[PDB]
Amino acid sequence: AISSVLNDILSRLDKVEAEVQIDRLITGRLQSLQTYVTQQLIRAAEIRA
Amino acid sequence: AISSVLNDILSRLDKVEAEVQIDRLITGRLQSLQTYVTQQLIRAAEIRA
Amino acid sequence: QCVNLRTRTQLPPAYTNSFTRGVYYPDKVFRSSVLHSTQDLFLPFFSNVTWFHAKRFDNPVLPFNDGVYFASTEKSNIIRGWIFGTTLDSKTQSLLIVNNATNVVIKVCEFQFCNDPFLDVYYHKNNKSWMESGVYSSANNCTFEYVSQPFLMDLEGKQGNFKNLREFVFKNIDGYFKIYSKHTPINLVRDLPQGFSALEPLVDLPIGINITRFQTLLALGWTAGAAAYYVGYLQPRTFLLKYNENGTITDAVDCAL
Amino acid sequence: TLADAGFIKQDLICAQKFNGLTVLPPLLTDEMIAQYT
Amino acid sequence: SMTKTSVDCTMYICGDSTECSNLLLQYGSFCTQLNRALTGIAVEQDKNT
Amino acid sequence: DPLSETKCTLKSFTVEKGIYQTSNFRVQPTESIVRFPNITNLCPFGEVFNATRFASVYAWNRKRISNCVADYSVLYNSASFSTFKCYGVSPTKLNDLCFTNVYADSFVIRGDEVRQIAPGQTGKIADYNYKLPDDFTGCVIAWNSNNLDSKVGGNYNYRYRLFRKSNLKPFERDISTEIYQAGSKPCNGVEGFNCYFPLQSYGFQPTNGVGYQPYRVVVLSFELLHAPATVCGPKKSTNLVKNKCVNFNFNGLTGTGVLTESNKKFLPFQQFGRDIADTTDAVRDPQTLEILDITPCSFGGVSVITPGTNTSNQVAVLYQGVNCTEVPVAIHADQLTPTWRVYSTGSNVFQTRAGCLIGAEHVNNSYECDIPIGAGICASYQT
Amino acid sequence: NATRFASVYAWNRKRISNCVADYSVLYNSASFSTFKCYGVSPTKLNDL
Numbered sequence A, B: 001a002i003s004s005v006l007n008d009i010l011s012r013l014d015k016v017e018a019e020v021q022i023d024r025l026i027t028g029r030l031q032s033l034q035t036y037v038t039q040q041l042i043r044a045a046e047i048r049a
Numbered sequence C: 001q002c003v004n005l006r007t008r009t010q011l012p013p014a015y016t017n018s019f020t021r022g023v024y025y026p027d028k029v030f031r032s033s034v035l036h037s038t039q040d041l042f043l044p045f046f047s048n049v050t051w052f053h054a055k056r057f058d059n060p061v062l063p064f065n066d067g068v069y070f071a072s073t074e075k076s077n078i079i080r081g082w083i084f085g086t087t088l089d090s091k092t093q094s095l096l097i098v099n100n101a102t103n104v105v106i107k108v109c110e111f112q113f114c115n116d117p118f119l120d121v122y123y124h125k126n127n128k129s130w131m132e133s134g135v136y137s138s139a140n141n142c143t144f145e146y147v148s149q150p151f152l153m154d155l156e157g158k159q160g161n162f163k164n165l166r167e168f169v170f171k172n173i174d175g176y177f178k179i180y181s182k183h184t185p186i187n188l189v190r191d192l193p194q195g196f197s198a199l200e201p202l203v204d205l206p207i208g209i210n211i212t213r214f215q216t217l218l219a220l221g222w223t224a225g226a227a228a229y230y231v232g233y234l235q236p237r238t239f240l241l242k243y244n245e246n247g248t249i250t251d252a253v254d255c256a257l
Numbered sequence D: 001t002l003a004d005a006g007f008i009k010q011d012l013i014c015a016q017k018f019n020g021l022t023v024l025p026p027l028l029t030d031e032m033i034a035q036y037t
Numbered sequence E: 001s002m003t004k005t006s007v008d009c010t011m012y013i014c015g016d017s018t019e020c021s022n023l024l025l026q027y028g029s030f031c032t033q034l035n036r037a038l039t040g041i042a043v044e045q046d047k048n049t
Numbered sequence F: 001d002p003l004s005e006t007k008c009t010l011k012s013f014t015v016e017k018g019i020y021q022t023s024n025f026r027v028q029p030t031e032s033i034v035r036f037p038n039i040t041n042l043c044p045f046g047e048v049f050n051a052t053r054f055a056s057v058y059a060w061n062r063k064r065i066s067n068c069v070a071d072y073s074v075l076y077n078s079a080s081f082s083t084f085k086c087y088g089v090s091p092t093k094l095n096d097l098c099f100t101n102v103y104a105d106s107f108v109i110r111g112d113e114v115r116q117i118a119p120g121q122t123g124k125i126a127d128y129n130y131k132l133p134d135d136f137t138g139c140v141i142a143w144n145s146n147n148l149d150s151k152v153g154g155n156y157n158y159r160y161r162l163f164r165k166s167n168l169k170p171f172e173r174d175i176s177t178e179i180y181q182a183g184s185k186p187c188n189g190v191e192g193f194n195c196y197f198p199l200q201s202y203g204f205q206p207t208n209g210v211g212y213q214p215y216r217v218v219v220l221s222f223e224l225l226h227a228p229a230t231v232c233g234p235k236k237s238t239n240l241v242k243n244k245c246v247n248f249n250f251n252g253l254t255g256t257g258v259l260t261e262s263n264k265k266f267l268p269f270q271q272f273g274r275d276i277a278d279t280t281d282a283v284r285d286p287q288t289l290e291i292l293d294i295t296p297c298s299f300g301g302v303s304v305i306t307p308g309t310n311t312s313n314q315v316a317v318l319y320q321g322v323n324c325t326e327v328p329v330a331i332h333a334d335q336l337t338p339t340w341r342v343y344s345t346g347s348n349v350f351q352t353r354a355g356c357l358i359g360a361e362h363v364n365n366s367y368e369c370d371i372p373i374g375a376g377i378c379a380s381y382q383t
Numbered sequence G: 001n002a003t004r005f006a007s008v009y010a011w012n013r014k015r016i017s018n019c020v021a022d023y024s025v026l027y028n029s030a031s032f033s034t035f036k037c038y039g040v041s042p043t044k045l046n047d048l
């Protein structure tokens, strides 16, 4: 995306351009949570043992 | 991407078109490592047990 | 008007290991109690700066690429300013950064320079203290100009008995040119100090030119003051910077050293 | 040397919480684990 | 045990934007599925203790 | 009510005994702050766009717009701009926004070269005499000027660099007149076969076709990383509140949170402070030179505590991580993410270790756990 | 730049082979009102 800050994307671009940048932040962030929760589920199984 | 070979993309396209193809290779490859490391963390827990 | 004084030929220049000098705040962002990485052009740690000392006088022409660190351990203000350009002979533009007893003047008109140019204290001339034109001949095609007042000033320090270290960085990127600086009172006779300090930004302007060379400017069959100055060349590096609780860079790591 | 016990917010911990990352209390406080022990 | 953590998947991904939150909804139940997983870990820390 | 929000989180008309997560609360902004530098004088857009004559592309002009109020609607509301494309902002958003500096580049070209001028393009103009950065943010503006720049004999004062050894760096200009060896032989002097002068006239005459007619071009190369800003769109600043939550906008940094007087000593060169998250956490107000801490205003998990719906429709609500000095402070005389204020009844508020519990009686008698609340507390349904 | 060209019903095909191209000698011309390339950059054709 043209910036990592969600408010800047929304300040600089109108809706149909902003949606293309915001979707890159959403896609990358969502993969970042899915990674964290996977690591934490695998740690939870070790602590569980 | 128009080819699976990173050097071909860089040989055939100039920077602003190449970035759109290279990002598809990066995104797919990165998901391929995140898959491998997840499988290996789950195997590592089996071998640990 | 060239007061041509080629008394001394090119001398094999002295060298000095720059321990931890050449670090500056990378952007106008406050940060505090954090270790932050920054890919930017910096002076590599423990690197050979060239060293100079103004019968003893010193003002060579130097190459410029990627950017420069400049510093001086000095008393009474002999070091007055800088030249930058690509051809230096009016086949291309070139720029002047002059400082005096207060003001700073900036100009990028297509100057022709003498082979041995510098600016003296013009005690007599047509009158006292004339405008600092005499480095160049012609100025008919001027694409930018600037001026400021409170640029650098001396320290009181019980009449300033110690040599006060003056540190500067000069840099260009994609048509912009930028300046950073710091001062410190120090008690070393003949070498650059062990210890640490960040440089704050002072000035920026959009010259829009190629640069390949630079030179220093000094005041005054004559007598003048003696002082050292040092030159280092910046390189693309990554530094990890420790901002203290007050948000000053207190320490750094040059992660290619 | 613990970090973020989630006992009432009113720094690394403050940065984390302000991005929607909350830390929950354990059911059994350190007095109750000491009593069982 | 380990530290119980939960995440607001909307405040993490879209923090305080409505026009980002309407794009996040196009990804379906993924945010709820992450919240569930983190709750399952968090309850297990009391089960373990 | 809170029970209904559990039913739609579980997607069931009945709920088993337990504690359940529900949509987070987050206190809404009371009102909007806006702040910009208290400058007043309008920027010189007339002579930037409608001066008598403009530079040739070899020596393309640059003027620095600074220390003034723009109005890019007064531009974009004109019919006169045949092209007005912005490449890192919407042309409509330019009014809601402020910039470190603006450089207005001005020059003239044949009407077919307007395509070459867009960022990251390539072609003889774009390669040898005027190149935008590939990462450029700014606007490109162009219009036909055959009815202004096309004297009948030919406007041969307008000219382009035909040849250059290598493609120039972004935003370079070149005024040199060096002769070009298009052949292998090392030519010198002034002229010869494959030994060309570098600068050639446009053939601008008023009978020329569309695409061969003269076009005036302006490029607004504005820069908006958050250094202290000097050119803003026209918006009225307003009085600055503290300790209340607000929407804020400082110099185009739109956000939401509570402002506070800060002991964080920014040095005079700085204006914004950033958190580990790359989000701003302090700002220097552009009208009073003072540093404000920004905290995003109170939010937390909302968990609902219930016996079975097959036992009661009473529930209690846990505001996770909240000093409920803010729960009664929330009061739905204004908006919140949750609509159910019904629980803010009072005379039951219990400030627990892991947040605050509304709608459950605190008893000094102790029992075996039933529904866990955290930090040693449990809840249960009894007489 | 031949004297005449085929109609679209029987559109012509010529095989370029066994020779050195120079697509800059083409793309450095002003004469091509359209010159769009769909699987390579028109600038990269020389390195290829």
Ligand SMILES: *[C@@H]1O[C@H](CO)[C@@H](O[C@@H]2O[C@H](CO)[C@@H](O[C@H]3O[C@H](CO)[C@@H](O)[C@H](O)[C@@H]3O)[C@H](O)[C@H]2NC(C)=O)[C@H](O)[C@H]1NC(C)=O
Pocket: C098, C100, C101, C102, C103, C104, C105, C129, C131, C132, C147
């Ligand atoms: C340090 O060097 C400066 C030039 O490099 C010099 O600035 C020059 O100062 C004189 C006197 O103030 C100015 O003269 C003009 O002053 C006003 C300007 O509005 C006019 O009314 C006068 O008629 C006269 O033209 C010069 O113009 C000025 N030059 C620049 C570029 O600003 C400083 O005075 C020097 N300072 C010391 C202490 O030596």
Ligand SMILES: *[C@@H]1O[C@H](CO)[C@@H](O[C@@H]2O[C@H](CO)[C@@H](O[C@H]3O[C@H](CO)[C@@H](O)[C@H](O)[C@@H]3O)[C@H](O)[C@H]2NC(C)=O)[C@H](O)[C@H]1NC(C)=O
Pocket: C140, C141, F059, F175
């Ligand atoms: C940089 O300075 C140069 C010297 O003043 C200047 O070049 C000069 O440009 C003018 C036109 O603006 C020429 O003047 C002559 O123009 C035509 C040429 O056929 C004659 O019919 C006129 O009578 C008039 O004499 C100069 O001859 C020319 N001089 C040189 C040495 O080339 C540049 O234009 C300046 N550059 C910029 C960007 O300002």
Ligand SMILES: *[C@@H]1O[C@H](CO)[C@@H](O[C@@H]2O[C@H](CO)[C@@H](O[C@H]3O[C@H](CO)[C@@H](O)[C@H](O)[C@@H]3O)[C@H](O)[C@H]2NC(C)=O)[C@H](O)[C@H]1NC(C)=O
Pocket: C244, C245, C246
């Ligand atoms: C962050 O910056 C603060 C401002 O410079 C600095 O506070 C200063 O700390 C020094 C050292 O303690 C004080 O020096 C004086 O201390 C006492 C009086 O409190 C005197 O007996 C001493 O003789 C000496 O004069 C400064 O007075 C104090 N300044 C202020 C305005 O309070 C912090 O210490 C800095 N912290 C860090 C970690 O950098």
Ligand SMILES: *[C@@H]1O[C@H](CO)[C@@H](O[C@@H]2O[C@H](CO)[C@@H](O[C@H]3O[C@H](CO)[C@@H](O)[C@H](O)[C@@H]3O)[C@H](O)[C@H]2NC(C)=O)[C@H](O)[C@H]1NC(C)=O
Pocket: F045, F046, F047, F049, F050
């Ligand atoms: C380019 O040159 C133009 C000629 O001066 C100039 O545009 C002119 O601006 C004025 C003020 O905006 C217009 O006056 C009319 O403005 C509105 C139109 O709805 C009315 O409310 C007013 O009563 C008045 O009728 C002129 O009409 C306008 N000229 C044209 C041909 O549109 C521009 O300012 C110049 N360019 C720049 C960037 O300044």
Ligand SMILES: *[C@@H]1O[C@H](CO)[C@@H](O[C@@H]2O[C@H](CO)[C@@H](O[C@H]3O[C@H](CO)[C@@H](O)[C@H](O)[C@@H]3O)[C@H](O)[C@H]2NC(C)=O)[C@H](O)[C@H]1NC(C)=O
Pocket: C086, C210, C211, C212, F165, F166, F168, F169
């Ligand atoms: C900025 O100014 C520089 C100094 O005038 C200029 O550098 C020169 O660039 C050209 C092209 O790269 C070089 O030309 C020579 O190239 C090779 C040797 O590297 C030879 O085989 C060729 O025959 C030709 O002579 C120059 O050697 C080089 N000069 C120096 C001192 O490095 C740059 O071109 C300018 N920057 C831009 C963006 O143009």
Ligand SMILES: *[C@@H]1O[C@H](CO)[C@@H](O[C@@H]2O[C@H](CO)[C@@H](O)[C@H](O)[C@H]2NC(C)=O)[C@H](O)[C@H]1NC(C)=O
Pocket: D008, D010, F323, F324, F325, F351
């Ligand atoms: C909840 O917040 C309030 C402040 O809004 C806290 O009240 C302060 O408590 C300290 C310690 O007992 C007293 O010295 C202050 O005088 C109190 N101030 C006020 C305005 O009442 C309260 O302690 C907080 N409670 C928790 C558990 O966080």
Ligand SMILES: *[C@@H]1O[C@H](CO)[C@@H](O)[C@H](O)[C@H]1NC(C)=O
Pocket: C015, C047, C048
């Ligand atoms: C610096 O210069 C000294 C000689 O004065 C030399 O011994 C040393 O190896 C040099 N180091 C580098 C990295 O240039």
Ligand SMILES: *[C@@H]1O[C@H](CO)[C@@H](O)[C@H](O)[C@H]1NC(C)=O
Pocket: C126, C127, C128
């Ligand atoms: C200095 O001399 C010039 C003539 O060269 C004269 O115009 C000016 O007034 C003099 N100034 C002073 C202060 O003597």
Ligand SMILES: *[C@@H]1O[C@H](CO)[C@@H](O)[C@H](O)[C@H]1NC(C)=O
Pocket: F038, F287, F288, F289
């Ligand atoms: C504008 O702000 C300054 C401080 O930067 C303040 O002193 C001044 O009073 C303000 N302008 C007006 C017209 O009041």
Ligand SMILES: *[C@@H]1O[C@H](CO)[C@@H](O)[C@H](O)[C@H]1NC(C)=O
Pocket: F308, F310
């Ligand atoms: C629901 O309540 C009824 C009595 O009203 C009772 O017969 C039944 O066993 C209960 N079922 C559950 C699962 O609680």
Ligand SMILES: *[C@@H]1O[C@H](CO)[C@@H](O)[C@H](O)[C@H]1NC(C)=O
Pocket: F362, F363, F364
């Ligand atoms: C709990 O007991 C203490 C005395 O031990 C008393 O002060 C407090 O008010 C009691 N709370 C309730 C809710 O009865």
